[PDB]
Design an enzyme around this catalytic site. Structure first.
Site, mmCIF file in Angstrom:
data_model
loop_
_atom_site.group_PDB
_atom_site.id
_atom_site.type_symbol
_atom_site.label_atom_id
_atom_site.label_comp_id
_atom_site.label_asym_id
_atom_site.label_seq_id
_atom_site.Cartn_x
_atom_site.Cartn_y
_atom_site.Cartn_z
ATOM 1 N N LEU A 249 0.839 -1.199 0.000
ATOM 2 C CA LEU A 249 0.000 0.000 0.000
ATOM 3 C C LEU A 249 0.878 1.254 0.000
ATOM 4 C CD1 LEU A 249 -2.631 -1.205 2.610
ATOM 5 C CD2 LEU A 249 -3.005 -1.002 0.147
ATOM 6 N N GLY A 250 1.499 1.513 -1.149
ATOM 7 C CA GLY A 250 2.074 2.824 -1.379
ATOM 8 C C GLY A 250 1.002 3.889 -1.279
ATOM 9 N N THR A 251 1.225 4.906 -0.452
ATOM 10 C CA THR A 251 0.108 5.627 0.143
ATOM 11 C C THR A 251 0.614 6.935 0.735
ATOM 12 O OG1 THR A 251 -1.293 3.692 0.598
ATOM 13 C CG2 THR A 251 -1.577 5.600 2.017
ATOM 14 N N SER A 252 -0.298 7.901 0.840
ATOM 15 C CA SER A 252 -0.186 8.995 1.798
ATOM 16 C C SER A 252 -1.493 9.093 2.570
ATOM 17 C CB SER A 252 0.126 10.317 1.092
ATOM 18 O OG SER A 252 -0.880 10.640 0.147
ATOM 19 N N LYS B 20 -8.911 3.829 0.470
ATOM 20 C CA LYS B 20 -8.011 3.291 1.481
ATOM 21 C C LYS B 20 -8.587 3.387 2.888
ATOM 22 C CE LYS B 20 -3.985 4.302 -1.351
ATOM 23 N NZ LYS B 20 -2.593 4.811 -1.414
#
Lengths: 176, 247, 202, 142, 163, 229, 217, 218, 202, 202
Positions: J5-8, J39
């Site tokens: 989960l590449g994410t901000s 998300k």
């Protein structure tokens, strides 16, 4: 195998001793004695090289090399092969012809100088003989007390030769 | 173009012309001299200047090669300067870096002689137009004094002089030299010889003099290694030279 | 180890023990979490200081609260022995707690207590203990104040505290993972446990 | 404009790459007697697993010189590197001396190495082909 | 396999090859194919060049020193190839046999016997007949554990059909 | 020419078969070191002198491969001597730093010498560190070796601007003592060298220094011979 | 000078400054086809050998009438070579060897010794020893002085002479069947028969004579 | 994750006639950092048994705690019977070899008296070979400790002067203590790990005595 | 284990010129080898650079640049900042396989009135209004991108650099110590320094 | 090649409660496998979490948490956010050797009036006023630390989260798409969405 083995040098009053468990591993270039442990091929190459260098020295100077100068020569000749060194542990012992100062030194593969005043050991079983020499050694041994100390220490390290070096004479002895 | 013919060659007489002409250039140079005492060596020369506006303190004709060895010359100063640079470099590279100690005077003189000789074989260069007096001390050979000529020949001397005054100076030294001189006697004889050899104004600023003597720990620049040896080469200040001249 | 605690430093003094920790958890080079208190008082008479993995720190802190909750049905020595046993059994399980722990306190007889334990279960006492970078930089400074156990009765609380603050200053100067904020606790046989939160290097 | 020597490995290899030491009987193979290297046994294929430093330390000075010439070309133009190189080649080509190992006294001045030592100065480091005649033949290309 | 025995009169060498370095000097060698024989033949060419230039045989000690130096110089540039060399020669100046062994690193040692048992048999005073008998015994024990034969002599080098 | 590689492949095949501190002060810099030397766990030589001299007023101490630090230090001392002779000037510490770092850079870190260089020159007192890769940083106080952390802890606890000569010597020797006590590699005596901007450098060897013999005839002599030389 | 200047005066990037590159790409004439000892490209890396790695039965014996051998590269009308190992390496290096032989015979005005030819081959193979060149050429011929001569040559640089060579998959069967019959004093057609029998036991004939080799099908 | 470390320090067992000596340095080491200057490396186990598991400190502590507990159970089961030194050795052997494939990374020595009252020393491989021994050094400087003592309690490679062996001697307990003292002094002089202090346990028929001696702090 | 310039460096063009600022921490792992290192390197009177990557290779590069630019100045007079950036580019690129260097170049130049060039590890060159680099720059990309303005005054740019580098120091362990800045303008070069007590209390 | 989960993600407490915001990009290398993924995961009516690390392990963990918390709610009524964070902690920690999960937990709870917990990869738990995580959080540490204020209004907190996540999206390639937010307050749960044309032009 004739590779390796052990060399030890030790200082007395107005004298030095150098000994090894034995082909031969103690060499002399006039009144300076060099003991070399390690690969016998490298021991032989070092002997040939330092014979060459000290013969040229004696020819150019008309003078036998002093043990301190020979120590610096050995150091610089080892460092020359900084990459792929000789796998050797040389030890120099001698007395300066002018001052009569007894002198010993030893080296690493690349010619770091120990120049320790008491005793020098190199090669196999070095830590055993370090313990022996530290326990047995006392400063200012007489030449025969020095002979007994060096020879007993060597025998307790694990067929040996001993040189007792005066300013004016050298005595070579053997041990079982 | 892969080859250059030898510039120095034998004449039908068997004499190498360029060597003779370099020795003539030496004969043309200003007088310099040196004297072994029992306890030192003196080397001295005239600071001939092309003007009074020149800074005599920059006319370093006498130069240290090692703390125990010094040189002086007569002839082509630029050649002497290049030879000094090379002799210092070779004293370090060939000897100090191998044996951890400065060369004896005999071997540094031999190295300078080798450098000067090879300019006599090359087809690219002329020989050097200088002869050098090299004075020094060695722990075994003691105090020594050598004269190196443009050929790269050298001989040990008790005293010698080179340049214009060379012959008259060598006669004055030969009559006045003796095997018992002290360094102060040798300095006095050197000063009298140069007074007799110099042209025009003879003062402590038209001369310079160096000695090889005892160690000078006040010139060592550090304290606390008692076996370590102060330089034996010492240039005299023009103050001290004038104080000698008032004798 | 992801979130790590910097270093704990401690020394014993004439009447007690001092322990300090820099209240910071680093996420690698990212100084991600501030205010991570790493000194855990375990009753009136001991503080367990923990360094390394902050998650393992919070697991050992709850093991210690569990210990206190069961005892309610402690000497510093008992808490240490339990901790050391857990640590060594986790080692032998090949599942170490990635922590170094100092149990500081005073025994009911009044003896000062300092023991170090690490993820290996290696243990030792000393007049001064530090973990991680503090073992190399802080320990030399504290060992100048109490070099040997005969120095303990000579060392006042004021001097031990000033020494601990100086060592924390030196760590802040020279440890890249150090915070300026730190917590300090004094466990004194006479005055009990004093736990000074949120001190700053100054 | 290089600091570390980049171009440091032979791109092509041949049995005839080494000239002046070729077999007269078969001008395609080395002369292992004249090589005096301890036989053919130093076969050219054994130029493998070289020390990582060696290929840079041998030619470090050459790379520094090339960078210096490049800098002089960029700032002063084509005249200055040309002059420097011509001087240097004149010195190199006129100093012939088969007996001396020592560097030319003027070469050091041109290189500005009058007051510099390196290990190549301190450590300047045969039954066939060591003779003065072999050096004459190398230098004249006989 | 290589084997050699120094006797009171002769040096005896045996192998399961060899090069004659001089009329009174023989070399035998074992090791990697190509590398070993290229080395042995470079050595042979060098000793022959010396012998021609001087019109004089190089002594066995000097020959073994040359082989040691050339082997060490061979290794310096490349990986050490496995080789072992026995040099058997009659020293016509000292008028006695000499045997030298050189290992793959150029370690040279003078030996009474060597190969690449006999301590219960070997005697310095043996004759070459006793030496040939001891060689037969040694080969018999080798075949129990699982040759060309040369003699070096005042009269030079000799082939022996009594293998 | 140069450092030979001629047994690299050979030795590969065969293998297939300290505390130093510098302390700048109001008119100078102090450098100090311990004098233990070790091979593995074994003390090869007590009282080993680790303070090298580059020039009369430029002094050096090093860690890493001892032979490397010695060789590079003596090479740079030779170059500094020759350059001082060429320019007829007392050598600068920045010149030693420059040529030392360019030398170590030439060898790309394969010459494993790490150094602290301290000196005084016509431009004042200077104190530098040099790393085997050729990286340098200036400082007012520095520490090096296995005990570098303990010595830096002491310096950072007690160092102050405008130390006097005596206070600076005290601080340096305290930091070396802390190394001796806290590091195993350090031990035995403390060496100090003091350089003041107007003064000769004061070397202080061992500034701080914190029977079984057998009767004659014990050993079984086999035989005797006289060797003469 | 001007040559020096022109060294400081777009060709660097594609490396057409490099003379051997200009030759290889046939910029500076056909000189690549004018050199003996053809130049071989090596990858410009610290471990060329690693990059490279990452990339029949025949018989001969000497007899009264010559040698019979039973892919036999015609190195010359007097020399035969059994291509063995890598076919590319064999074809190439045997053609080069044939050219070296032609040059030798031209210069010296004699047929090359089979010993000399086999030595040249083994020396070259050794020089490339350890980099490819899988090779097993058995070298066969007859010379007025030498007589019938046999040398095997190997990738490892082995060179060996003998009265019989058996090589390939049935080599032990061929050797056993031959030794049951081999003689020096064979008659020509008798030796041809024994040869064919020994090949048949291991399932071309070449007869080698002072006037050259002959193929008997 | 490596489950072992080296904590340095050294141990020395000497068997007398009516005594046995077990000595060890008290310094605790990690890498080049001193962890502490006084850890007690040698332990009274009761029953006139003294023990030290030299090597990895944590495994030594574990082994000695398991041994002491086993002794407790031996007493419970056998009504306070004195555990014999041979039975103690067999116990420690089975404790060690139970780790055969995950061994305690320690060399351990026990000293005591046998049923004769004769001085006894036993030393055990980390996988539990053991021997009765008259003396044994262990740890990093064991090679320094032992040869001197083998030259001073034994007289090996000595001869009667000029009579080209001198007979061995029995030694009083204080004389061997003094030889341990001197040996450890020499080893701390030459080996950097040999601690800041020397603690000596003396086993006698009267019981165990503890002695402590300071050594150089560097 | 070569020294790498763990760093936060930040150059900002403004109305009168350019300000180049840096922290002063350098680290060997977690050890701060020097806590007051001056990372700002003068390559010319009005041309300055900041170094990142290895300390040895970047120091060698910067010394070769300073040589090249002094030679240039002696021939043509003062270089432009674009010239200096070109030299940096050529050295970084032609040694890119051997040397790992990243450079922010800042300089004043009276025709261009202040310029900034960044040369990342690849040896690309990009002219920018401001540049940030080093470990600590990552934490302040959003702050600088939100708070940067074209043609700030000197005082506004000093404030902006202080707030940015203070946040970089806050979040990055590898950067810290004092903040150092050079202000480059037609008026000259002005050194500035801000201490933790002057920027942590922000 | 597991999905990570590449994410901000960014949770912020405010005057009335807490706002939890996220981007909606998910990436498989350089490919955006879904550009509008949600998300934000509800584990309870007023208890929400955001997931980071592997998608499979975090989804399994969050489903087990939702099970545990529904069971709890059926037994004791609504859990506190601290309860949920405890369950997350226990699952993340006891599986820490097998599962790589990092969680920001946000929730409203009428006794506590809104709380935020972050559970980094180690399985530590830290209560904070706001939390940022994922690849893109690194670029906005300085912005959030400078611009965050305690007891913001709802509108101020929505603006703050928009500006932060817009900068994270600007600088991080692995985060993008629409910004999604849930507002959690005593009034209920409110979904919010902001499109690129509403946040890129900021």
């Amino acid at each position: 195998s004739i590779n390796g083995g052990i060399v030890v040098a030790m200082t007395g009053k107005d004298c030095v001793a150098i000994a090894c468990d034995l082909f031969e591993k103690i060499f002399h270039y006039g009144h300076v004695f060099l003991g070399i442990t390690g690969l016998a091929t490298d021991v032989t190459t070092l002997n040939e090289m330092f014979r060459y260098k000290t013969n040229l020295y004696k020819l150019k100077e008309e003078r036998a090399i002093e043990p301190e100068t020979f120590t610096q020569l050995v150091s610089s000749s080892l460092y020359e092969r900084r990459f792929g060194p000789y796998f050797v542990g040389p030890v120099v012992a001698g007395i300066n012809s002018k001052s009569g100062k007894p002198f010993i030194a030893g080296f690493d593969l690349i010619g770091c100088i120990d120049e320790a005043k008491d005793f020098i050991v190199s090669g196999t079983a070095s830590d055993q003989l370090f313990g022996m020499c530290e326990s047995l050694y006392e400063p200012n041994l007489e030449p025969e007390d020095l002979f007994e100390t060096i020879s007993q220490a060597l025998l307790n390290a694990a067929g040996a030769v001993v040189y007792i070096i005066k300013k004016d004479e050298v005595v070579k002895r053997y041990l079982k | 173009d892969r080859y250059s013919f030898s510039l120095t060659t034998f004449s039908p007489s068997g004499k190498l012309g360029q060597i003779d002409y370099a020795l003539t250039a030496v004969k043309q140079g200003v007088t310099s001299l040196g004297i072994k005492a029992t306890n030192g060596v003196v080397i001295a020369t005239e600071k001939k200047s092309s003007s009074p506006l020149a800074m005599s303190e920059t006319l370093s004709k006498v130069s240290l090669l090692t703390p125990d060895i010094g040189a002086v010359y007569s002839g082509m100063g630029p050649d002497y300067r290049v030879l000094v640079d090379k002799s210092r470099k070779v004293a370090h590279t060939s000897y100090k870096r191998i044996y951890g100690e400065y060369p004896p005077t005999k071997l540094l003189v031999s190295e300078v002689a080798k450098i000067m000789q090879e300019a006599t074989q090359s087809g690219g260069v002329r020989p050097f137009g200088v002869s050098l007096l090299i004075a020094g001390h060695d722990e075994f050979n003691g105090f020594s004094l050598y004269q190196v000529d443009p050929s790269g020949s050298y001989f040990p001397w008790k005293a010698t002089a080179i340049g214009k005054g060379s012959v008259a100076a060598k006669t004055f030294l030969e009559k006045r030299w003796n095997d018992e001189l002290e360094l102060e006697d040798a300095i006095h004889i050197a000063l009298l010889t140069l007074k007799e050899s110099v042209e025009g104004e003879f003062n402590g600023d038209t001369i310079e003099l160096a000695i090889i003597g005892d160690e000078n720990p006040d010139l060592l620049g550090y304290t606390g290694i008692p076996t370590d040896k102060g330089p034996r080469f010492r240039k005299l200040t023009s103050q001290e030279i004038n104080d000698r001249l008032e004798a | 180890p992801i979130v790590t605690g910097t270093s704990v430093i401690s020394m014993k003094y004439d009447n007690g023990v001092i322990i300090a920790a820099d209240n910071l958890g680093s996420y690698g080079s990212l100084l991600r979490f501030n205010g991570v208190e790493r000194l855990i008082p375990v009753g009136d008479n001991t503080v367990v200081g923990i360094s390394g993995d902050i998650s393992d720190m919070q697991h050992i802190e709850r093991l210690l609260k569990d210990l206190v909750t069961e005892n309610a049905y402690l000497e510093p020595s008992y808490i240490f022995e339990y901790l050391a046993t857990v640590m060594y059994q986790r080692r032998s399980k090949m599942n170490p707690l990635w922590n170094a722990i100092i149990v500081a306190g005073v025994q009911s007889n009044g003896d000062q207590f300092l023991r170090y334990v690490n993820l290996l279960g290696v243990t030792y006492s000393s007049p001064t203990l530090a973990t991680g970078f503090g073992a190399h930089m802080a320990n030399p400074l504290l060992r100048k104040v109490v070099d040997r156990e005969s120095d303990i009765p000579k060392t006042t609380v004021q001097v031990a505290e000033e020494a601990i603050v100086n060592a924390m200053r030196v760590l802040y100067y020279r440890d890249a993972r150090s915070s300026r904020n730190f917590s300090l606790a004094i466990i004194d046989k006479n005055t009990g446990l004093t736990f000074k939160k949120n001190l700053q290097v100054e | 404009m290089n600091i570390v020597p980049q171009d440091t490995f032979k791109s092509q290899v041949s049995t005839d790459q080494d000239k002046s030491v070729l077999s007269s009987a078969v001008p395609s193979l080395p002369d292992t007697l004249r090589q005096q290297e301890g036989g053919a046994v130093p076969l050219s294929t054994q130029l493998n697993d070289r020390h990582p430093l060696e290929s840079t330390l041998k030619n470090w000075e050459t790379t520094q010189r090339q960078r210096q010439m490049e800098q002089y070309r960029q700032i002063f133009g084509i005249a200055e590197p040309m002059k420097r190189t011509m001087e240097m080649e004149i010195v190199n080509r006129t100093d012939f001396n088969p007996l001396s190992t020592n560097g030319s006294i003027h070469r050091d001045i041109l290189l500005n190495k009058e007051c510099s030592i390196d290990w190549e100065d301190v450590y300047p480091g045969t039954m066939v082909g060591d003779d003065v005649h072999s050096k004459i033949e190398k230098q004249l290309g006989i | 396999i290589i084997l050699g025995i120094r006797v009171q009169d002769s040096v005896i060498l045996a192998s399961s090859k060899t090069r004659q370095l001089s009329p009174h000097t023989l070399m035998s060698f074992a090791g990697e194919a190509g590398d070993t024989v290229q080395f042995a033949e470079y050595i042979q060419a060098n000793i022959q060049l010396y012998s021609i230039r001087e019109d004089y045989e190089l002594s066995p000690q000097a020959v073994s020193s040359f082989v040691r130096q050339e082997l060490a110089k061979s290794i310096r540039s490349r990986r050490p190839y496995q080789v072992n060399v026995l040099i058997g020669g009659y020293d016509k100046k000292k008028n006695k046999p000499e045997l030298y062994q050189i290992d793959y690193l150029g370690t040279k040692v003078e030996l009474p016997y060597g190969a690449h048992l006999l301590d219960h048999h070997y005697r310095p005073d043996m004759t070459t007949e006793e030496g040939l008998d001891l060689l037969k015994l040694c080969v018999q024990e080798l075949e129990k554990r699982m040759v060309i034969v040369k003699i070096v002599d005042k009269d030079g080098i000799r082939q022996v059909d009594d293998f | 020419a140069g450092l030979s590689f001629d047994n690299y492949q050979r030795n590969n095949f065969l293998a297939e078969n300290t505390t130093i501190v510098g302390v700048k002060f109001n008119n100078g810099v102090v450098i100090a070191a311990d004098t233990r030397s070790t091979q593995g766990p074994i003390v090869a030589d007590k009282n080993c002198a680790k303070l090298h001299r580059i020039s009369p007023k430029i002094w050096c101490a090093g860690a890493g491969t001892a032979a490397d630090t010695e060789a590079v230090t003596q090479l740079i001392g030779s170059n500094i001597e020759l350059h001082s002779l060429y320019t007829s000037r007392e050598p600068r510490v920045v010149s030693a730093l420059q040529m030392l770092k360019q030398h170590l850079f030439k060898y790309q870190g394969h010459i494993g010498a790490y150094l602290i260089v301290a000196g005084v020159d016509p431009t004042g007192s200077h104190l530098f560190s040099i790393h085997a890769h050729g990286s340098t940083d200036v400082g007012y106080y520095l520490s090096l070796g296995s005990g570098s952390l303990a010595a830096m802890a002491v310096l950072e606890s007690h160092w102050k601007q405008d130390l006097t000569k005596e206070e600076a010597i005290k601080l340096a020797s305290d930091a070396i003592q802390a190394g001796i006590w806290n590091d195993l590699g350090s031990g035995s005596n403390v060496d100090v060298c003091v350089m003041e901007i107007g003064k000769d450098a004061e070397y202080l060897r061992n500034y701080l220094t914190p029977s079984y013999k057998f009767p004659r005839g014990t050993t079984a002599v086999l035989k005797e011979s006289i060797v003469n030389i | 000078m001007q040559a020096i200047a022109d060294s400081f005066s777009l060709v660097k990037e594609l490396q057409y400054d490099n003379e051997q590159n200009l030759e290889s790409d046939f910029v500076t004439g056909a000189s690549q086809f004018q050199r003996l000892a053809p130049s071989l490209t090596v990858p410009p890396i610290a471990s060329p050998q690693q990059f490279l790695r990452a990339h029949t039965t025949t018989l001969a014996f000497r007899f009264q009438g010559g040698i019979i051998v039973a892919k036999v590269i015609e190195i010359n009308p007097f020399l035969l070579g059994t291509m063995a190992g890598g076919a590319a390496d064999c074809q190439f290096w045997e053609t080069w060897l044939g050219s070296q032989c032609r040059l030798h015979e031209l210069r010296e005005k004699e047929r090359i010794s089979v010993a000399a030819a086999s030595k040249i081959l083994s020396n070259l193979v050794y020089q490339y020893k350890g980099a490819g060149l899988s090779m097993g050429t058995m070298i066969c011929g007859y010379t007025r002085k030498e007589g019938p001569t046999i040398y095997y040559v190997d990738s490892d640089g082995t060179r060996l002479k003998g009265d019989i060579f058996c090589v390939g998959s049935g080599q032990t069967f061929a050797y056993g069947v031959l030794d049951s019959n081999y003689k020096w004093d064979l008659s020509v057609e008798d030796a041809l028969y024994l040869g064919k029998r020994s090949i048949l036991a291991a399932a071309n004939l070449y007869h080698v004579t002072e006037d050259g080799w002959i193929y008997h099908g | 994750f490596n489950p072992y470390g080296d904590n340095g320090g050294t141990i020395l067992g000497i068997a007398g006639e009516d005594f046995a000596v077990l000595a060890g340095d008290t310094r605790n080491i990690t890498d080049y950092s001193i962890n502490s200057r006084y850890e007690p490396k040698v332990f009274d186990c009761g029953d006139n048994i003294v023990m030290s598991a030299n090597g990895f400190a944590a495994d030594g502590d574990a082994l000695v705690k398991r041994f002491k507990n086993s002794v407790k159970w031996y007493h419970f089961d056998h009504n306070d019977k004195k555990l014999s030194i041979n039975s103690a050795a067999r116990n420690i052997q089975h404790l060690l070899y139970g780790k055969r494939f995950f061994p305690y990374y320690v060399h351990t020595i026990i000293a005591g008296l046998d049923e004769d009252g004769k001085g006894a020393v036993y030393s055990f491989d980390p996988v539990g070979s053991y021997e009765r021994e008259q003396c044994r050094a262990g740890g990093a400087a064991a090679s320094l400790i032992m040869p001197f003592l083998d030259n001073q309690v034994n007289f090996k490679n000595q001869y009667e002067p000029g009579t080209n062996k001198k007979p061995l001697k029995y030694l009083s307990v204080e004389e061997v203590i003094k030889l341990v003292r001197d040996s450890f002094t020499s080893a701390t002089e030459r080996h950097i790990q040999v601690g800041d202090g020397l603690e000596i346990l003396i086993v006698t028929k009267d019981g165990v005595r503890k002695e402590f001696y300071e050594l150089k702090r560097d | 284990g070569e020294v790498s310039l763990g760093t936060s460096i930040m150059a900002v063009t403004f109305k009168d010129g350019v300000i180049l600022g840096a922290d002063s921490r350098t680290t060997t792992g977690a050890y701060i080898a020097n806590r007051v290192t001056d990372k700002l390197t003068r390559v010319h009177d009005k041309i300055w650079c900041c170094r990142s990557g290895s300390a040895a290779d970047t120091q060698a590069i910067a010394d070769i640049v300073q040589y090249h630019l002094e030679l240039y100045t002696s021939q043509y007079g003062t270089p432009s900042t674009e010239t200096a950036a070109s030299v940096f580019k050529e050295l970084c690129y032609e040694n890119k396989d051997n040397l790992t260097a990243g450079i922010i170049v800042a300089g004043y130049d009276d025709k261009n009135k202040g310029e900034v060039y960044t040369i990342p590890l690849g040896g690309s060159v990009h002219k920018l209004p401001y540049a940030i680099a080093g470990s600590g720059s990552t934490f302040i990309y959003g702050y600088c991108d939100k708070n940067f303005r074209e043609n700030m005054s000197k005082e506004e740019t000093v404030d902006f650099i202080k707030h940015s580098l203070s946040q970089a120091i806050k979040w990055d362990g590898s950067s810290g110590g004092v903040i150092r800045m050079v202000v480059l303008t037609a008026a000259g070069v002005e050194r500035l320094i801000f201490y933790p007590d002057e920027y942590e209390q922000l």
